[PDB]
Structures are given as C-alpha cells and as structure tokens.
A and B are shown apart, each in its own frame.
Chain A
C-alpha cells in the first residue's frame, strides 16, 4: 500500500 506525505490546503 502507498501513502501520501503531503497535506493539501486551499
């Protein structure tokens, strides 16, 4: 399984 390491905000 793969995971993100960046959280995105507007």
Chain B
C-alpha cells in the first residue's frame, strides 16, 4: 500500500512556504511543512477573505495521533485527516497547494 505524506507537504521553511503561496495562488493556499526545531509539523495558509493574510498553525505529534493547536485543540489519527479537517473547518476555502 502507499502511505505518503499529504500532497501539500513540502520540506520547506516558513519563508519558502509563504513565497510559494504568493507566487502561485492558482495552485492552492495551504502547505504542510516540517515544524521548525521539532519533529512536529506546521501548516502555512494564505487566505483572501478580507485582505490577503499569511497564517501558521502548529500540528503536534502526540502518541500515534496529531493535535492541531487551536483555541479548542483537535486530535486526528494521521496527516491526511489533518488536511481534511482544515478544508472542512474553513468550508472549502483552504485548498492544498499542489505544486
């Protein structure tokens, strides 16, 4: 079976992720990347609801699950599930960046 990293996962820095999203909005507005200084992950998004805004979120590995660090934390079993949650919670506004 195939169990890769989500399609929007890139081994890029916070700055690189930010630049990728600005340069090609047509390809999506959400990137999953390695978390700086940790084995955890980060999600960088570019939303254009009112004005363009770049936002970063922490996704922590906890046991065999991942906890998205939000006001009310959400815990899911894998990274595909985390991407599904970001899309669902933003009602489709977030779309994985497919380079």
A residues with CB within 8 A of B: 1-10
Q: B1-9, B20-28, B53-61: which one contacts chain A?
A: B53-61
Interface residues of B (CB under 8 A from A): 14, 36, 42, 47, 49, 55-58, 69-71, 86, 89-91, 93
What are 21 contact pairs spanning A and B, CB under 8 A? A1-B14, A1-B36, A3-B55, A3-B56, A4-B55, A4-B56, A4-B57, A5-B69, A5-B70, A5-B71, A6-B70, A6-B71, A7-B57, A7-B70, A7-B86, A7-B89, A7-B90, A8-B49, A8-B90, A9-B89, A9-B91
The distance in angstroms between the C-alpha atoms of A1 and B86, with both chains bound, is 21
